Amino acid sequence: SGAIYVGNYRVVNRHLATHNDWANLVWEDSSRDLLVSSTTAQGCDTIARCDCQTGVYYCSSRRKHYPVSFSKPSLIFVEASEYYPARYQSHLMLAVGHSEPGDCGGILRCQHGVVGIVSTGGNGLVGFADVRDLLWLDE
Ligand SMILES: COc1ccncc1CC(=O)N1CCC[C@H](C(N)=O)C1
Ligand SMILES: [Zn+2]
């Protein structure tokens, strides 16, 4: 689990979203595994507006933060699961690192702020859903 709280928004993995999240839907995108919902409290997370390719992420399956190098956001093929069939997920960034399904939601951070959240993984790889392009999270 895990979410980003910025301003009047909550950013979660679309596969892990709750009933409240859908009842207060702002935006959702299946191809990105992203869901944004409205909140009754003001969020304090800073979203990075950058080109960074290095950061640190939280891996709850290890109770540790890991520094990683990661790829530019792109379309990557993701194996079929119980939430989605076999498809290309967009805005996805891969890194070499420990990952487990319950690890989705873990924040990826750089010097500039929050980059995105854990969304895919397996075989010594971890994939992060990018949120740096969503300029409206600040306006
Ligand atoms: C962090 O997740 C994992 C890590 C290691 N083995 C497996 C996983 C699980 C994973 O990749 N998923 C399953 C749930 C939906 C995901 C998606 N975006 O389509 C894909
Ligand atoms: Zn940055």
Short mmCIF file of N, CA, C and O and ligand atoms in Angstrom, two decimals:
data_model
loop_
_atom_site.label_atom_id
_atom_site.label_comp_id
_atom_site.label_asym_id
_atom_site.label_seq_id
_atom_site.Cartn_x
_atom_site.Cartn_y
_atom_site.Cartn_z
N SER A 1 0.83 -1.22 0.00
CA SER A 1 0.00 0.00 0.00
C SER A 1 0.87 1.28 0.00
O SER A 1 2.10 1.19 0.05
N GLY A 2 0.22 2.45 -0.10
CA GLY A 2 0.88 3.76 -0.11
C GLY A 2 0.25 4.77 -1.05
O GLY A 2 -0.20 4.42 -2.15
N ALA A 3 0.21 6.03 -0.64
CA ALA A 3 -0.39 7.11 -1.46
C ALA A 3 0.45 8.40 -1.39
O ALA A 3 1.26 8.56 -0.48
N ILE A 4 0.25 9.31 -2.35
CA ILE A 4 0.90 10.63 -2.32
C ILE A 4 -0.23 11.61 -1.96
O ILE A 4 -1.34 11.53 -2.49
N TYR A 5 0.04 12.50 -1.01
CA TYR A 5 -0.95 13.48 -0.57
C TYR A 5 -0.43 14.85 -0.91
O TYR A 5 0.52 15.30 -0.27
N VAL A 6 -0.98 15.49 -1.94
CA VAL A 6 -0.56 16.81 -2.39
C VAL A 6 -1.75 17.72 -2.53
O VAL A 6 -2.65 17.42 -3.30
N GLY A 7 -1.77 18.83 -1.78
CA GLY A 7 -2.88 19.77 -1.84
C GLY A 7 -4.20 19.11 -1.47
O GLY A 7 -4.26 18.43 -0.45
N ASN A 8 -5.22 19.23 -2.35
CA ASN A 8 -6.49 18.59 -2.05
C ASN A 8 -6.64 17.22 -2.75
O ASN A 8 -7.77 16.73 -2.91
N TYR A 9 -5.50 16.58 -3.09
CA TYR A 9 -5.50 15.30 -3.81
C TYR A 9 -4.83 14.13 -3.08
O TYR A 9 -3.93 14.31 -2.25
N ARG A 10 -5.27 12.91 -3.45
CA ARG A 10 -4.69 11.66 -2.98
C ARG A 10 -4.36 10.86 -4.22
O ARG A 10 -5.22 10.68 -5.08
N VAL A 11 -3.11 10.43 -4.37
CA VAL A 11 -2.68 9.70 -5.56
C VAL A 11 -2.41 8.27 -5.19
O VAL A 11 -1.52 8.04 -4.40
N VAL A 12 -3.12 7.32 -5.76
CA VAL A 12 -2.93 5.91 -5.45
C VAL A 12 -2.79 5.06 -6.73
O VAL A 12 -3.19 5.49 -7.82
N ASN A 13 -2.34 3.79 -6.57
CA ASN A 13 -2.36 2.79 -7.63
C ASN A 13 -3.85 2.56 -7.92
O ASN A 13 -4.67 2.49 -6.99
N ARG A 14 -4.22 2.53 -9.19
CA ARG A 14 -5.59 2.33 -9.59
C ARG A 14 -6.07 0.93 -9.17
O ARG A 14 -7.26 0.78 -8.84
N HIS A 15 -5.16 -0.08 -9.15
CA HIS A 15 -5.60 -1.42 -8.75
C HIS A 15 -5.91 -1.51 -7.24
O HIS A 15 -6.85 -2.22 -6.87
N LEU A 16 -5.24 -0.71 -6.40
CA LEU A 16 -5.48 -0.72 -4.95
C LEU A 16 -6.50 0.32 -4.43
O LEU A 16 -6.63 0.48 -3.22
N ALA A 17 -7.15 1.08 -5.31
CA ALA A 17 -8.07 2.14 -4.89
C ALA A 17 -9.26 1.63 -4.07
O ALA A 17 -9.69 0.49 -4.24
N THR A 18 -9.76 2.46 -3.15
CA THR A 18 -10.89 2.13 -2.27
C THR A 18 -12.26 2.61 -2.85
O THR A 18 -12.30 3.19 -3.93
N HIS A 19 -13.37 2.36 -2.14
CA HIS A 19 -14.68 2.87 -2.52
C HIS A 19 -14.73 4.38 -2.39
O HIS A 19 -15.39 5.02 -3.20
N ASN A 20 -14.08 4.93 -1.35
CA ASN A 20 -14.03 6.37 -1.08
C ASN A 20 -13.35 7.07 -2.23
O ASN A 20 -13.91 8.04 -2.74
N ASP A 21 -12.19 6.53 -2.67
CA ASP A 21 -11.40 6.99 -3.82
C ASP A 21 -12.30 7.09 -5.08
O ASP A 21 -12.26 8.10 -5.78
N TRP A 22 -13.12 6.06 -5.36
CA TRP A 22 -14.02 6.10 -6.53
C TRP A 22 -15.22 7.03 -6.33
O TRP A 22 -15.74 7.59 -7.30
N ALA A 23 -15.68 7.18 -5.09
CA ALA A 23 -16.78 8.07 -4.76
C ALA A 23 -16.35 9.55 -4.83
O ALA A 23 -17.21 10.43 -4.90
N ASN A 24 -15.02 9.83 -4.75
CA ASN A 24 -14.45 11.18 -4.80
C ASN A 24 -13.41 11.25 -5.94
O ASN A 24 -12.36 11.89 -5.77
N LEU A 25 -13.68 10.55 -7.06
CA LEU A 25 -12.82 10.44 -8.24
C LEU A 25 -12.58 11.80 -8.84
O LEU A 25 -13.54 12.53 -9.06
N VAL A 26 -11.29 12.13 -9.13
CA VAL A 26 -10.88 13.34 -9.82
C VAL A 26 -10.43 12.93 -11.25
O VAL A 26 -10.89 13.48 -12.26
N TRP A 27 -9.58 11.90 -11.32
CA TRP A 27 -9.00 11.38 -12.53
C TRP A 27 -8.48 9.95 -12.30
O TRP A 27 -7.99 9.64 -11.24
N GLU A 28 -8.60 9.10 -13.30
CA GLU A 28 -8.06 7.75 -13.25
C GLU A 28 -7.51 7.38 -14.64
O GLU A 28 -8.01 7.88 -15.66
N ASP A 29 -6.48 6.53 -14.70
CA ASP A 29 -5.93 6.07 -15.99
C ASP A 29 -5.41 4.63 -15.85
O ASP A 29 -4.34 4.42 -15.26
N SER A 30 -6.18 3.66 -16.38
CA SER A 30 -5.87 2.23 -16.38
C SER A 30 -4.50 1.93 -16.99
O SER A 30 -3.79 1.07 -16.50
N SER A 31 -4.16 2.60 -18.11
CA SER A 31 -2.88 2.35 -18.77
C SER A 31 -1.70 2.80 -17.93
O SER A 31 -0.58 2.38 -18.20
N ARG A 32 -1.91 3.66 -16.94
CA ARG A 32 -0.84 4.13 -16.07
C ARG A 32 -0.94 3.52 -14.66
O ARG A 32 -0.05 3.79 -13.85
N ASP A 33 -2.03 2.78 -14.34
CA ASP A 33 -2.29 2.26 -13.00
C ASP A 33 -2.36 3.44 -12.00
O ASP A 33 -1.97 3.29 -10.84
N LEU A 34 -2.90 4.60 -12.42
CA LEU A 34 -3.04 5.76 -11.51
C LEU A 34 -4.47 6.10 -11.23
O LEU A 34 -5.33 5.98 -12.09
N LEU A 35 -4.72 6.57 -10.02
CA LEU A 35 -6.03 7.04 -9.61
C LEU A 35 -5.82 8.21 -8.66
O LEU A 35 -4.98 8.15 -7.77
N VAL A 36 -6.52 9.30 -8.90
CA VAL A 36 -6.44 10.48 -8.06
C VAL A 36 -7.86 10.77 -7.52
O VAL A 36 -8.84 10.74 -8.29
N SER A 37 -7.97 10.95 -6.21
CA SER A 37 -9.22 11.27 -5.53
C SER A 37 -9.09 12.53 -4.64
O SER A 37 -7.99 12.89 -4.23
N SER A 38 -10.23 13.19 -4.35
CA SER A 38 -10.23 14.43 -3.55
C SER A 38 -10.21 14.19 -2.03
O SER A 38 -10.78 13.21 -1.56
N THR A 39 -9.54 15.06 -1.26
CA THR A 39 -9.48 14.89 0.21
C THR A 39 -10.00 16.10 0.99
O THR A 39 -9.95 17.23 0.50
N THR A 40 -10.44 15.86 2.24
CA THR A 40 -10.95 16.90 3.14
C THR A 40 -9.86 17.53 4.04
O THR A 40 -10.18 18.21 5.02
N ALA A 41 -8.59 17.26 3.75
CA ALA A 41 -7.45 17.78 4.50
C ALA A 41 -6.35 18.15 3.51
O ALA A 41 -6.24 17.53 2.45
N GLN A 42 -5.55 19.17 3.84
CA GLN A 42 -4.49 19.66 2.95
C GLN A 42 -3.18 18.83 3.04
O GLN A 42 -2.55 18.79 4.10
N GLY A 43 -2.78 18.23 1.91
CA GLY A 43 -1.57 17.42 1.74
C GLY A 43 -0.26 18.19 1.62
O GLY A 43 -0.20 19.25 1.00
N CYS A 44 0.81 17.63 2.18
CA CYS A 44 2.10 18.32 2.24
C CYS A 44 3.24 17.70 1.41
O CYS A 44 4.40 18.08 1.62
N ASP A 45 2.94 16.75 0.51
CA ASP A 45 3.99 16.15 -0.32
C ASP A 45 4.34 17.07 -1.48
O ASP A 45 3.46 17.62 -2.14
N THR A 46 5.63 17.20 -1.76
CA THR A 46 6.10 18.02 -2.87
C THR A 46 6.30 17.11 -4.07
O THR A 46 6.98 16.09 -3.95
N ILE A 47 5.70 17.45 -5.22
CA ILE A 47 5.89 16.65 -6.43
C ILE A 47 7.10 17.23 -7.17
O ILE A 47 7.22 18.44 -7.31
N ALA A 48 8.01 16.37 -7.63
CA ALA A 48 9.17 16.82 -8.40
C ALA A 48 8.73 17.17 -9.82
O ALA A 48 7.89 16.50 -10.42
N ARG A 49 9.29 18.25 -10.34
CA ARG A 49 9.12 18.72 -11.69
C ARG A 49 10.56 18.67 -12.24
O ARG A 49 11.31 19.65 -12.09
N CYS A 50 10.97 17.49 -12.76
CA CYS A 50 12.37 17.32 -13.15
C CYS A 50 12.59 16.25 -14.20
O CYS A 50 11.66 15.55 -14.57
N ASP A 51 13.87 16.06 -14.60
CA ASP A 51 14.33 15.05 -15.55
C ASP A 51 15.17 13.93 -14.87
O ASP A 51 15.66 13.06 -15.58
N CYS A 52 15.31 13.95 -13.52
CA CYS A 52 16.08 13.01 -12.69
C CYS A 52 15.98 11.55 -13.08
O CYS A 52 14.90 11.06 -13.36
N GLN A 53 17.10 10.84 -13.01
CA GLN A 53 17.12 9.40 -13.27
C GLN A 53 17.74 8.58 -12.13
O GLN A 53 18.19 7.47 -12.35
N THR A 54 17.83 9.17 -10.95
CA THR A 54 18.34 8.56 -9.73
C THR A 54 17.45 9.07 -8.63
O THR A 54 17.02 10.23 -8.64
N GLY A 55 17.22 8.21 -7.67
CA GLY A 55 16.38 8.52 -6.52
C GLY A 55 16.50 7.45 -5.44
O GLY A 55 17.42 6.64 -5.48
N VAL A 56 15.58 7.44 -4.49
CA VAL A 56 15.48 6.48 -3.38
C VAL A 56 14.00 6.05 -3.30
O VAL A 56 13.11 6.88 -3.48
N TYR A 57 13.72 4.76 -3.07
CA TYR A 57 12.34 4.29 -2.94
C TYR A 57 12.11 3.48 -1.66
O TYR A 57 13.05 2.89 -1.13
N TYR A 58 10.85 3.42 -1.21
CA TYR A 58 10.55 2.65 -0.02
C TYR A 58 10.05 1.27 -0.38
O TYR A 58 9.15 1.13 -1.20
N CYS A 59 10.68 0.25 0.19
CA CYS A 59 10.34 -1.14 -0.07
C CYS A 59 9.80 -1.70 1.23
O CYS A 59 10.59 -1.97 2.15
N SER A 60 8.46 -1.76 1.36
CA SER A 60 7.85 -2.24 2.59
C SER A 60 8.11 -3.69 2.88
O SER A 60 8.14 -4.06 4.05
N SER A 61 8.36 -4.51 1.84
CA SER A 61 8.71 -5.92 2.03
C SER A 61 10.10 -6.12 2.69
O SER A 61 10.47 -7.23 3.05
N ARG A 62 10.86 -5.03 2.85
CA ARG A 62 12.16 -5.08 3.47
C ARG A 62 12.31 -4.03 4.58
O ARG A 62 13.39 -3.95 5.18
N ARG A 63 11.28 -3.17 4.81
CA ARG A 63 11.32 -2.05 5.76
C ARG A 63 12.57 -1.19 5.57
O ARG A 63 13.18 -0.74 6.55
N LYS A 64 12.95 -1.00 4.27
CA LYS A 64 14.15 -0.23 3.91
C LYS A 64 13.90 0.69 2.71
O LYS A 64 13.04 0.40 1.87
N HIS A 65 14.71 1.76 2.61
CA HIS A 65 14.78 2.71 1.51
C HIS A 65 15.99 2.30 0.67
O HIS A 65 17.05 1.96 1.22
N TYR A 66 15.83 2.28 -0.65
CA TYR A 66 16.90 1.83 -1.53
C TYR A 66 17.17 2.87 -2.57
O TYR A 66 16.25 3.28 -3.28
N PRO A 67 18.45 3.23 -2.75
CA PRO A 67 18.78 4.16 -3.84
C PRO A 67 18.77 3.42 -5.19
O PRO A 67 19.25 2.28 -5.26
N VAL A 68 18.21 4.03 -6.25
CA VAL A 68 18.13 3.39 -7.57
C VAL A 68 18.46 4.33 -8.73
O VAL A 68 18.28 5.55 -8.63
N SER A 69 18.85 3.77 -9.84
CA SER A 69 18.94 4.47 -11.11
C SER A 69 17.67 3.99 -11.83
O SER A 69 17.29 2.83 -11.65
N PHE A 70 16.98 4.85 -12.58
CA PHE A 70 15.75 4.41 -13.22
C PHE A 70 15.59 4.97 -14.62
O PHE A 70 16.24 5.95 -14.98
N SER A 71 14.81 4.26 -15.44
CA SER A 71 14.65 4.64 -16.83
C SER A 71 13.68 5.80 -17.02
O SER A 71 12.96 6.17 -16.09
N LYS A 72 13.73 6.43 -18.21
CA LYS A 72 12.84 7.51 -18.62
C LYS A 72 11.43 6.93 -18.75
O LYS A 72 11.28 5.80 -19.22
N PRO A 73 10.38 7.68 -18.35
CA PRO A 73 9.00 7.15 -18.46
C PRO A 73 8.66 6.68 -19.87
O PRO A 73 8.95 7.37 -20.84
N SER A 74 8.14 5.45 -19.98
CA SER A 74 7.83 4.88 -21.28
C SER A 74 6.80 3.75 -21.20
O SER A 74 6.33 3.41 -20.11
N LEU A 75 6.40 3.21 -22.36
CA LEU A 75 5.46 2.10 -22.46
C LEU A 75 6.25 0.82 -22.25
O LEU A 75 7.23 0.59 -22.95
N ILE A 76 5.85 0.00 -21.28
CA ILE A 76 6.55 -1.25 -21.00
C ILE A 76 5.50 -2.36 -20.89
O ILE A 76 4.43 -2.13 -20.33
N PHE A 77 5.80 -3.55 -21.45
CA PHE A 77 4.88 -4.68 -21.37
C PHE A 77 4.83 -5.25 -19.96
O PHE A 77 5.86 -5.55 -19.39
N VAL A 78 3.62 -5.39 -19.41
CA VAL A 78 3.36 -5.91 -18.08
C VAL A 78 2.51 -7.17 -18.21
O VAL A 78 1.44 -7.12 -18.83
N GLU A 79 3.00 -8.28 -17.64
CA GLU A 79 2.35 -9.60 -17.59
C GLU A 79 0.94 -9.47 -16.99
O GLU A 79 0.72 -8.64 -16.10
N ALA A 80 -0.01 -10.28 -17.46
CA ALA A 80 -1.39 -10.28 -16.97
C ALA A 80 -1.49 -10.59 -15.46
O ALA A 80 -0.77 -11.44 -14.96
N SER A 81 -2.40 -9.91 -14.76
CA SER A 81 -2.62 -10.10 -13.33
C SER A 81 -4.14 -10.20 -13.05
O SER A 81 -4.94 -10.26 -14.00
N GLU A 82 -4.55 -10.23 -11.77
CA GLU A 82 -5.99 -10.29 -11.43
C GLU A 82 -6.68 -8.92 -11.53
O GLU A 82 -7.90 -8.83 -11.37
N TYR A 83 -5.91 -7.84 -11.78
CA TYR A 83 -6.43 -6.48 -11.90
C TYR A 83 -6.51 -6.03 -13.35
O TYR A 83 -7.40 -5.25 -13.71
N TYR A 84 -5.58 -6.49 -14.19
CA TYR A 84 -5.55 -6.09 -15.59
C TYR A 84 -5.11 -7.25 -16.46
O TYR A 84 -4.24 -8.02 -16.03
N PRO A 85 -5.55 -7.31 -17.73
CA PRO A 85 -4.99 -8.35 -18.63
C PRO A 85 -3.54 -7.98 -19.08
O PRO A 85 -2.95 -7.02 -18.57
N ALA A 86 -2.95 -8.76 -19.99
CA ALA A 86 -1.60 -8.46 -20.48
C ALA A 86 -1.63 -7.19 -21.38
O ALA A 86 -2.28 -7.19 -22.44
N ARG A 87 -0.95 -6.10 -20.93
CA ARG A 87 -0.90 -4.86 -21.69
C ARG A 87 0.39 -4.06 -21.52
O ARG A 87 1.25 -4.42 -20.70
N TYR A 88 0.53 -2.98 -22.32
CA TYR A 88 1.63 -2.05 -22.22
C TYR A 88 1.15 -0.97 -21.29
O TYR A 88 0.14 -0.33 -21.56
N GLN A 89 1.85 -0.77 -20.18
CA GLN A 89 1.57 0.27 -19.23
C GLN A 89 2.45 1.45 -19.62
O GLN A 89 3.63 1.28 -19.89
N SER A 90 1.88 2.65 -19.69
CA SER A 90 2.61 3.85 -20.08
C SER A 90 3.14 4.63 -18.86
O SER A 90 2.74 4.35 -17.70
N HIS A 91 4.08 5.56 -19.10
CA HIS A 91 4.66 6.38 -18.05
C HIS A 91 5.32 5.53 -16.94
O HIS A 91 5.31 5.90 -15.78
N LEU A 92 5.87 4.37 -17.33
CA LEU A 92 6.49 3.45 -16.39
C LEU A 92 7.99 3.56 -16.44
O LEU A 92 8.57 3.67 -17.53
N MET A 93 8.64 3.55 -15.28
CA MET A 93 10.10 3.67 -15.17
C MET A 93 10.65 2.45 -14.46
O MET A 93 10.27 2.21 -13.32
N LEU A 94 11.56 1.68 -15.10
CA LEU A 94 12.14 0.51 -14.43
C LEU A 94 13.51 0.81 -13.79
O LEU A 94 14.27 1.63 -14.30
N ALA A 95 13.80 0.07 -12.70
CA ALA A 95 15.06 0.08 -11.96
C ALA A 95 15.36 -1.36 -11.51
O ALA A 95 14.44 -2.18 -11.40
N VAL A 96 16.64 -1.67 -11.25
CA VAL A 96 17.06 -2.96 -10.70
C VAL A 96 16.86 -2.82 -9.18
O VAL A 96 17.37 -1.87 -8.58
N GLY A 97 16.06 -3.69 -8.58
CA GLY A 97 15.80 -3.64 -7.14
C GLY A 97 14.74 -4.61 -6.64
O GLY A 97 13.88 -5.04 -7.40
N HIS A 98 14.78 -4.92 -5.33
CA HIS A 98 13.80 -5.82 -4.74
C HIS A 98 12.38 -5.23 -4.77
O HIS A 98 12.15 -4.05 -4.45
N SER A 99 11.43 -6.08 -5.14
CA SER A 99 10.04 -5.73 -5.32
C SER A 99 9.16 -6.94 -4.95
O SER A 99 9.55 -8.07 -5.19
N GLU A 100 7.96 -6.69 -4.39
CA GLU A 100 6.94 -7.70 -4.05
C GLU A 100 5.52 -7.08 -4.27
O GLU A 100 5.42 -5.86 -4.18
N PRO A 101 4.43 -7.83 -4.56
CA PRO A 101 3.13 -7.17 -4.88
C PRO A 101 2.60 -6.17 -3.85
O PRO A 101 2.15 -5.07 -4.22
N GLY A 102 2.72 -6.50 -2.57
CA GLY A 102 2.33 -5.61 -1.47
C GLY A 102 3.15 -4.34 -1.36
O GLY A 102 2.85 -3.46 -0.54
N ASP A 103 4.20 -4.22 -2.19
CA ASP A 103 5.09 -3.08 -2.27
C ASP A 103 4.58 -1.93 -3.08
O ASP A 103 5.19 -0.85 -3.02
N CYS A 104 3.47 -2.13 -3.82
CA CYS A 104 2.83 -1.08 -4.62
C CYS A 104 2.42 0.06 -3.72
O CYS A 104 1.94 -0.20 -2.61
N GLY A 105 2.67 1.29 -4.16
CA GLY A 105 2.33 2.47 -3.39
C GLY A 105 3.53 3.14 -2.75
O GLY A 105 3.47 4.33 -2.42
N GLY A 106 4.63 2.41 -2.60
CA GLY A 106 5.87 2.92 -2.03
C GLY A 106 6.37 4.09 -2.85
O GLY A 106 6.32 4.04 -4.06
N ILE A 107 6.74 5.17 -2.19
CA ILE A 107 7.16 6.39 -2.86
C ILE A 107 8.60 6.30 -3.41
O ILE A 107 9.49 5.73 -2.77
N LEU A 108 8.80 6.85 -4.62
CA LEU A 108 10.09 7.08 -5.23
C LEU A 108 10.34 8.61 -5.09
O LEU A 108 9.44 9.40 -5.37
N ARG A 109 11.51 9.00 -4.57
CA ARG A 109 11.87 10.40 -4.28
C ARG A 109 13.23 10.72 -4.83
O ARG A 109 14.13 9.89 -4.76
N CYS A 110 13.43 11.98 -5.25
CA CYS A 110 14.74 12.50 -5.67
C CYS A 110 14.99 13.82 -4.90
O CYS A 110 14.17 14.19 -4.07
N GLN A 111 16.11 14.56 -5.17
CA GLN A 111 16.35 15.84 -4.49
C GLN A 111 15.20 16.82 -4.67
O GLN A 111 14.95 17.63 -3.78
N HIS A 112 14.47 16.72 -5.81
CA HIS A 112 13.37 17.62 -6.19
C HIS A 112 11.99 17.30 -5.60
O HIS A 112 11.06 18.10 -5.71
N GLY A 113 11.86 16.13 -5.01
CA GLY A 113 10.62 15.70 -4.40
C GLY A 113 10.19 14.34 -4.88
O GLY A 113 11.01 13.55 -5.36
N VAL A 114 8.88 14.07 -4.75
CA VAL A 114 8.22 12.83 -5.13
C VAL A 114 8.20 12.63 -6.65
O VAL A 114 7.61 13.43 -7.35
N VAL A 115 8.81 11.53 -7.14
CA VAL A 115 8.88 11.17 -8.56
C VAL A 115 7.65 10.34 -9.02
O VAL A 115 7.07 10.61 -10.07
N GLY A 116 7.30 9.33 -8.24
CA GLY A 116 6.16 8.45 -8.51
C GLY A 116 6.03 7.37 -7.46
O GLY A 116 6.63 7.48 -6.40
N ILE A 117 5.21 6.32 -7.72
CA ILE A 117 4.99 5.24 -6.75
C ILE A 117 5.25 3.82 -7.33
O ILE A 117 5.02 3.60 -8.52
N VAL A 118 5.64 2.83 -6.50
CA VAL A 118 5.85 1.44 -6.95
C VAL A 118 4.55 0.91 -7.61
O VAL A 118 3.46 1.21 -7.10
N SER A 119 4.66 0.25 -8.77
CA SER A 119 3.48 -0.18 -9.50
C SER A 119 3.63 -1.55 -10.13
O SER A 119 2.61 -2.20 -10.35
N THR A 120 4.87 -1.94 -10.51
CA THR A 120 5.18 -3.25 -11.11
C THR A 120 6.51 -3.80 -10.52
O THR A 120 7.22 -3.07 -9.84
N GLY A 121 6.86 -5.05 -10.80
CA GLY A 121 8.11 -5.63 -10.33
C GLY A 121 8.24 -7.11 -10.62
O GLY A 121 7.29 -7.75 -11.07
N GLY A 122 9.41 -7.65 -10.33
CA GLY A 122 9.67 -9.07 -10.53
C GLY A 122 10.95 -9.32 -11.27
O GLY A 122 11.30 -8.56 -12.16
N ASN A 123 11.67 -10.39 -10.89
CA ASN A 123 12.94 -10.81 -11.52
C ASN A 123 14.10 -9.88 -11.21
O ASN A 123 15.03 -9.80 -12.00
N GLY A 124 14.07 -9.25 -10.05
CA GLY A 124 15.11 -8.31 -9.67
C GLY A 124 14.85 -6.90 -10.19
O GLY A 124 15.73 -6.05 -10.11
N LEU A 125 13.65 -6.64 -10.74
CA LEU A 125 13.27 -5.33 -11.27
C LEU A 125 12.10 -4.75 -10.48
O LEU A 125 11.28 -5.48 -9.95
N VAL A 126 12.00 -3.43 -10.46
CA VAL A 126 10.93 -2.69 -9.83
C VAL A 126 10.56 -1.59 -10.81
O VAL A 126 11.44 -0.98 -11.41
N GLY A 127 9.26 -1.41 -11.03
CA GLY A 127 8.69 -0.40 -11.91
C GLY A 127 7.92 0.65 -11.13
O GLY A 127 7.16 0.32 -10.22
N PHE A 128 8.11 1.94 -11.50
CA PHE A 128 7.48 3.08 -10.82
C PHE A 128 6.57 3.86 -11.77
O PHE A 128 6.98 4.20 -12.89
N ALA A 129 5.33 4.14 -11.33
CA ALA A 129 4.38 4.95 -12.09
C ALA A 129 4.81 6.39 -11.93
O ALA A 129 4.82 6.87 -10.81
N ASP A 130 5.16 7.08 -13.02
CA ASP A 130 5.59 8.48 -12.94
C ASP A 130 4.40 9.42 -12.67
O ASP A 130 3.30 9.18 -13.16
N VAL A 131 4.63 10.48 -11.85
CA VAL A 131 3.63 11.54 -11.55
C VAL A 131 4.18 12.97 -11.81
O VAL A 131 3.49 13.94 -11.55
N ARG A 132 5.42 13.09 -12.30
CA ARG A 132 6.03 14.39 -12.54
C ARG A 132 5.39 15.17 -13.69
O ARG A 132 5.51 16.39 -13.74
N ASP A 133 4.70 14.47 -14.61
CA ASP A 133 4.06 15.15 -15.73
C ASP A 133 2.72 15.79 -15.34
O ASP A 133 2.23 16.67 -16.06
N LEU A 134 2.11 15.35 -14.23
CA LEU A 134 0.79 15.83 -13.83
C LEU A 134 0.86 17.17 -13.16
O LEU A 134 0.76 17.26 -11.94
N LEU A 135 1.01 18.23 -13.97
CA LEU A 135 1.17 19.60 -13.47
C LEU A 135 0.01 20.11 -12.64
O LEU A 135 0.24 20.91 -11.73
N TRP A 136 -1.22 19.63 -12.92
CA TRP A 136 -2.44 20.03 -12.21
C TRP A 136 -2.45 19.64 -10.73
O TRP A 136 -3.17 20.28 -9.95
N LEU A 137 -1.62 18.67 -10.32
CA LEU A 137 -1.50 18.35 -8.89
C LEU A 137 -1.07 19.59 -8.04
O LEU A 137 -1.18 19.55 -6.83
N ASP A 138 -0.59 20.67 -8.69
CA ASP A 138 -0.14 21.88 -8.02
C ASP A 138 -1.02 23.12 -8.27
O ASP A 138 -0.93 24.08 -7.51
N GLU A 139 -1.81 23.13 -9.35
CA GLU A 139 -2.62 24.29 -9.71
C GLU A 139 -3.99 24.33 -9.03
O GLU A 139 -4.72 25.33 -9.15
C1 LIG B 1 5.33 -4.41 -7.22
O1 LIG B 1 4.59 -5.48 -7.80
C2 LIG B 1 5.23 -6.68 -7.96
C3 LIG B 1 6.52 -6.94 -7.55
C4 LIG B 1 6.99 -8.23 -7.66
N1 LIG B 1 6.27 -9.24 -8.15
C5 LIG B 1 5.04 -8.96 -8.57
C6 LIG B 1 4.45 -7.70 -8.51
C7 LIG B 1 3.01 -7.47 -8.94
C8 LIG B 1 2.90 -6.63 -10.20
O2 LIG B 1 3.90 -6.26 -10.80
N2 LIG B 1 1.65 -6.34 -10.63
C9 LIG B 1 0.42 -6.92 -10.05
C10 LIG B 1 -0.57 -5.83 -9.68
C11 LIG B 1 -0.83 -4.90 -10.87
C12 LIG B 1 0.48 -4.31 -11.42
C13 LIG B 1 0.21 -3.47 -12.66
N3 LIG B 1 0.66 -2.23 -12.64
O3 LIG B 1 -0.40 -3.94 -13.63
C14 LIG B 1 1.40 -5.48 -11.79
ZN ZN B 2 14.47 15.44 -9.44
#
